[PDB]
Ligand binder design. Structure first.
Ligand SMILES: COc1cc(C(=O)N2CCC(N3CCN(C)CC3)CC2)ccc1Nc1ncc2c(n1)N(C)c1ccccc1C(=O)N2C
Ligand SMILES: Nc1nc2c(ncn2[C@@H]2O[C@H](COP(=O)(O)OP(=O)(O)O)[C@@H](O)[C@H]2O)c(=O)[nH]1
Length: 1141
């Protein structure tokens, strides 16, 4: 819409050049600490161009501030350059580090070089050097687009600055980015409106910490609604970030997405305060760095911002000593040390701050923190480090300048011993890891040149050989021959030990005499990103040989070794040998192929148990990898190798193909390597830096593929373009609804929790394994939520085993009995008002004659509704009991009988064959108790098929009956022997289950009583709250009780807990919670030839009654899993211990 005449201006230069005083003359000064931001309203007299306003920055020239400048140096700018002329011609050459860094970070930027001090300096000498470098700049590929040059006088307003100012305004209008003019570019009016509110809020934002969260910005934009949207806001924020009026850091590694900085000048001043408030540091900085340090002003804001001080307690990169401290090496013999100079054209801006930060780990001899070695006598200075463990094991990474060489070096000074070779192997890997991630400009194709120093004889000249030439000589032979005479030779293991893989442990090395290998394309096991895998025999075994191709440097091979020869785990593949002469790695053999071959062509052996261990083992490997500061980035259902398809085994899954695995420290990673279709959203974009949590999204996609049995991969094979776009976006479909899989209610919760767009909301790899370690995650098949505000007190499962799996619910949320039909495989809920009063309990009666199926109902009024299961117009009521009906349990001795439990202790037996009559009479009305004692405790005996005695309970009494319909026992329960637990023993009985003894539950009774049927005495008193005391008047009731056949006892508490008691003697197997608020009804059902389901109905309290379906195999699963985890804990410790030893 309206033109946007805003441009950001940057002024760079070395200290003493006069960058600030130059700006002062144009806009018409002891030092420029930090960065000084200004506004420059300039009017273009020529034509009718809008009055330009320039956000001028005054980048400091003092060498201590150079570490944090590049982060505030971005595109959309017109960089100046100031060089002093009193120095002569060396000052122009001294600007070269400044010029190189500008082009590296700001590729499209019209740099103008501006001189100074014309009053007391010459120009002819400077012009000779200035013209030479710019002629050498157009053919350098590292310099910026220098398209001007000037010489400017002192602070007095002379004619020279008039030309300089005219140049800047002309250059800014001539500036073009993406073939479009930056100054005056068209822009939507909404973005300009957002700029206005930010400026207004900048004036009243707190000065101690100026920032607004996402909530504040959301509230402001909502009440304005200046033609904005919810998805156009990130575009608006990013555009304002480029201009320079709102700094937003959306990098997932930084975790600063929520915060919106509305004060760019404040952000560049914090670094100045830290510096000006060495070898020795004190606690003064963390205590009284500024007057804003207090309890509340330094609690919420301090957790938001971090900026290299690892907790110990402060060591900033800019306070280190300028010059190298005095040091003395144990020896200086030319044949006792190893030197690995890195000749580079220029030190990158902030290179040494990161390298010093990275090399502050202490585990070079026991990787992954297996054994924290002795703290070395570390020495600190601006460009270098001096880790020193022993007089025979030291490293001296540090800068060095040689005579007649304007370039910079990176001298390593490791010793020529076994511990010297180990250190050089790791230091070089970490240096190459930094320059691959953070400084790709140096590794651009060949600016960097790596030299290895060797000396045939001590005392002679210490010569140089380019390392790539040594690599070609190393592959043709293991010895170095002197061209002058072959009499004297030195090995390659003393010049470049890492070249010939001499730093690896002696346990793994290619003994090429017991290795029977055939490269013929018949023993082929697959392919890979950079190699091929072949079958082979190593020391009389079966191995998989990874052989690399011609287009592969040793850096690629070493990138795999750092994760393979240092980390040992049952879920990570391991090496047996590694050579360089044929350039192969010898790996373990996955017996039954990669997981992809199982998903597609073997969709018959994937049970719900095997799928869990595969997801568990991969998340187990990720937890170890992420705990060793290593990211994977290549998690696909191709790299998950299976060793055996047995649900109960020590090792099942395994992770391989560590081809693009690189270290991911607290600074994060920047490269975007990966496989299309399996990448996290942050990995898909190439403009952000992501942390290790980006790998969790990749695991979630793998877990998504496991659940759907590779449905997504097959669908994406037809349209690869949509495969990458949909996975990266995150609008993935619901798995159970579309692809047609068996429901898994709380791994779909895990998938939707670890696939969130915001990386901070994704669970850590250590938390995903904890969730997957839940033993109830395997045996919870289904979970249904009933409609809002329904109170169902009874249920029954239609058990014909072949007709239809359905649940019949008697609702009670209204004062009129509603009998509801629930279709389990469809989740179709329908109700029907059939009774005047609430229905208390239901029961299914099945007559084998004529295949008639009927269900009986019990109402509080007293009626007994009977309706056919299939026919909906077969209602016929029986004669009403004296009082309410509470239990209708039906079982056969022979003859099918329908026991009726009336609320006045009156059990009237009714004949199942008599249900067809529309109104009948009880066969024999037996009396157990009076009206005051309810009879609501019917049960049966499942032991030894003893369908003779049917133990029940009336009030606080125990009763029984047989086919003779006589009471064989009437046992009193009101009296308590201990006389202390009588309060919870003075309530009426609820439910009884019998296997060999009697288990008694009472209202509001946290105790369950075990009574022997032979001695009529309470054998045991199990206190439920005793078992809940470890996990927590109290919500520890016993509202339902179900007894599995011969394995365990399921006790359901009123607080939503489920107790699995080991039926052997006493043991508590497990306690289950965080899924329901009040368990009400529990029973065992069988559904669709898939038996062993324990229907648990509870209210998730607005009352949401949840009907979750478990497996009665759970008491075995909880014990099986913990033994399985315990075994893999021993293997993990054994493998790590033997490696570190
Ligand atoms: C017995 O071990 C495996 C067998 C199979 C497999 O089912 N076949 C079936 C038939 C097929 N060929 C038959 C003969 N010819 C016609 C060519 C085609 C290939 C082999 C597939 C994989 C097997 N095991 C295996 N272990 C370790 C790996 C790895 N893979 N490779 C290929 C890797 C793949 C991905 C990531 C890492 C690796 C890996 O590093 N290693 C060491
Ligand atoms: N470049 C320049 N500097 C001058 C001149 N006359 C005096 N100076 C001094 O140079 C200093 C310039 O400081 P400056 O380099 O801008 O500080 P910095 O931005 O922190 O490096 C001022 O403090 C002046 O006292 C002049 O003619 N040219």
């Amino acid at each position: 819409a309206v033109p946007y005449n805003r441009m950001k201006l940057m002024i760079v230069g070395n200290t003493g050049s006069g960058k600030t005083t130059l700006l002062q003359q144009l806009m018409k000064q002891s030092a420029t600490v930090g960065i000084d931001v200004k506004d420059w309203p300039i009017q273009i007299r020529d034509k009718r161009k809008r009055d330009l306003v320039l956000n001028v920055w005054d980048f400091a020239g003092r060498e201590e501030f150079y570490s944090t400048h590049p982060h505030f140096m971005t595109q959309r700018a017109l960089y100046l350059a100031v060089y002093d002329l009193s120095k002569g011609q060396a000052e122009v050459d001294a600007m070269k580090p400044w010029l190189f860094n500008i082009k590296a970070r700001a590729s499209s930027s019209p740099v103008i070089l501006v001189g100074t001090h014309l009053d007391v300096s010459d120009e002819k000498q400077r012009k000779a050097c200035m013209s030479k470098i710019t002629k050498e700049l157009l053919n350098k590929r590292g310099f910026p687009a220098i398209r001007d040059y000037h010489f400017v006088n002192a602070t007095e307003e002379s004619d020279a600055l008039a030309k300089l100012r005219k140049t800047i305004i002309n250059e800014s209008l001539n500036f073009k980015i993406r073939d479009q003019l930056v100054v005056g570019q068209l822009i939507p009016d909404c973005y300009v409106e957002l700029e206005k509110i930010i400026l207004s809020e900048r004036k009243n934002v707190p000065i101690e910490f100026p920032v607004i969260d996402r909530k504040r910005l959301l509230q402001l934009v909502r009440e304005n609604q200046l033609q904005l949207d919810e998805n156009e806001l990130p575009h608006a924020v990013h555009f304002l970030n480029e201009s320079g009026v709102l700094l937003h850091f959306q990098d997932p590694a930084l975790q600063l997405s929520d915060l919106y900085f509305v004060e760019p000048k404040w952000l560049c001043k914090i670094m100045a305060q830290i510096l000006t408030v060495k070898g020795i540091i004190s606690r003064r900085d963390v205590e009284k760095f500024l007057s804003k340090k207090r309890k509340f002003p330094k609690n919420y804001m301090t957790q938001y911002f971090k900026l290299i001080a690892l907790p110990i307690y402060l060591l900033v990169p800019s306070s280190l000593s300028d010059h190298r401290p005095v040091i003395e090496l144990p020896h200086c013999e030319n044949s006792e040390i190893i030197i690995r100079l890195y000749e580079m054209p220029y030190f990158p801006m902030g290179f040494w701050s990161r390298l010093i930060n990275r090399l502050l780990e202490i585990s070079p001899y026991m990787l992954s923190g297996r054994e924290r070695a002795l703290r070395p006598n570390r020495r600190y200075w601006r460009q270098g480090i001096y880790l020193n463990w022993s007089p025979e094991a030291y490293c001296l990474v540090g800068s060095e300048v040689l005579d007649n060489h304007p370039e910079s070096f990176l001298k390593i000074t490791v010793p020529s011993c076994r511990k010297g070779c180990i250190l050089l192997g790791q230091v070089v890997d970490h240096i190459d890891s930094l320059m691959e991630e953070w400084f790709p400009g140096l590794l651009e194709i060949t600016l960097l040149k790596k030299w290895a120093l060797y000396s045939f004889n001590d005392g002679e000249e210490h010569q140089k050989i380019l390392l790539d030439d040594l690599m070609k000589k190393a592959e043709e032979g293991d010895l170095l021959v002197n061209p002058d005479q072959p009499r004297l030779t030195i090995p390659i293991s003393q010049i470049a030990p890492d070249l010939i893989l001499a730093d690896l442990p002696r346990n793994i090395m290619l003994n090429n005499d017991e290795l029977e290998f055939e490269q013929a394309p018949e023993f082929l096991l697959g392919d890979g990103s950079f190699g091929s895998v072949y079958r082979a025999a190593y020391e009389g075994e079966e191995v998989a040989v990874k052989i690399f191709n011609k287009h592969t440097s040793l850096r690629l091979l070493r990138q795999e070794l750092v994760v393979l020869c240092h980390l040992h785990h049952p879920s990570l593949i391991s090496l047996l040998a590694a050579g360089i002469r044929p350039r192969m790695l010898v790996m373990e053999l996955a017996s039954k192929g990669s997981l992809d071959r199982l998903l597609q062509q073997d969709k018959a052996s994937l049970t719900r148990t095997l799928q869990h261990r595969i997801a568990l083992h991969v998340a187990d490997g990720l937890r170890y990898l992420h705990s060793a500061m290593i990211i994977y980035r290549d998690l696909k259902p191709h790299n998950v190798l299976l060793f055996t398809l047995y649900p109960n085994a020590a090792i099942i899954a395994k992770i391989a193909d560590y081809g693009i695995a690189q270290y991911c420290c607290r600074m994060g990673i920047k490269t975007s390597e990966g496989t299309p279709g399996f990448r996290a959203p942050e990995v898909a974009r190439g403009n952000v830096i992501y942390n290790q949590q980006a790998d969790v999204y990749s695991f979630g996609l793998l877990l998504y593929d496991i659940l759907t049995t590779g449905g997504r991969i097959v669908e994406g094979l037809k349209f690869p373009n949509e495969f990458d776009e949909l996975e990266i976006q995150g609008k993935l479909p619901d798995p159970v609804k579309e692809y047609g899989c068996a429901p898994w209610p709380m791994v779909e919760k895990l998938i939707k929790q670890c696939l969130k767009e915001n990386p901070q909301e994704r669970p850590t790899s250590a938390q995903v394994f904890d969730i997957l370690n839940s033993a109830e995650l395997v045996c919870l098949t289904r979970r249904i939520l009933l409609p809002k505000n329904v109170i169902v007190e009874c249920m029954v499962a239609t058990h014909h085993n072949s007709r239809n799996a359905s649940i019949w619910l008697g609702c009670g949320h209204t004062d009129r009995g509603q009998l509801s039909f629930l279709d389990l495989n469809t989740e179709g809920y329908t109700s029907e008002e059939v009774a005047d009063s609430r229905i208390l309990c239901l029961a299914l009666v099945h007559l084998p004659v004529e295949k008639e199926s009927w269900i009986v109902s019990g109402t509080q009024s007293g009626t007994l509704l009977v309706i056919n299961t299939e026919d909906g117009k077969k209602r016929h009521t029986l004669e009403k009991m004296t009082d309410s009906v509470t239990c209708l349990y039906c079982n056969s001795f022979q003859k099918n009988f329908l026991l009726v439990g009336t609320a006045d202790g009156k059990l009237a037996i009714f004949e199942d064959k008599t249900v067809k009559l529309k109104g009948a009479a009880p066969l024999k009305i037996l009396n157990i108790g009076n009206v005051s004692t309810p009879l609501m405790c019917l049960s049966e005996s499942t032991n030894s098929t003893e369908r003779n005695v049917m133990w029940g309970g009336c009030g606080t009494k125990i009763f029984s009956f047989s086919n003779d319909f006589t009471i064989q026992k009437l046992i009193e329960t009101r009296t308590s022997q201990l006389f202390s637990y009588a309060a919870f023993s003075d309530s009426n009985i609820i439910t009884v289950v019998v296997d060999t003894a009697l288990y008694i539950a009472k209202q509001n009774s946290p105790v369950v009583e075990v009574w022997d049927k032979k001695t009529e005495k309470l054998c045991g008193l199990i206190d439920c709250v005793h078992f809940l005391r470890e996990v927590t008047s109290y919500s520890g009731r016993v509202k339902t009780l179900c007894l599995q056949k011969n394995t365990a006892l399921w006790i359901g508490t009123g607080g939503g807990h489920i107790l699995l008691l080991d039926l052997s003697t006493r043991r508590l197997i497990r306690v289950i919670y965080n899924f329901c608020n009040s368990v009400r009804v529990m029973m065992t059902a069988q559904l669709g030839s898939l038996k062993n389901v324990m229907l648990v109905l509870g209210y998730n309290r607005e009352i949401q009654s949840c009907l979750t379906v478990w497996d009665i195999n759970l008491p075995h699963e909880v014990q099986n899993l913990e033994k399985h985890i315990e075994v893999r804990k021993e293997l993990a410790e054994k493998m790590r211990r033997t490696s570190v030893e």
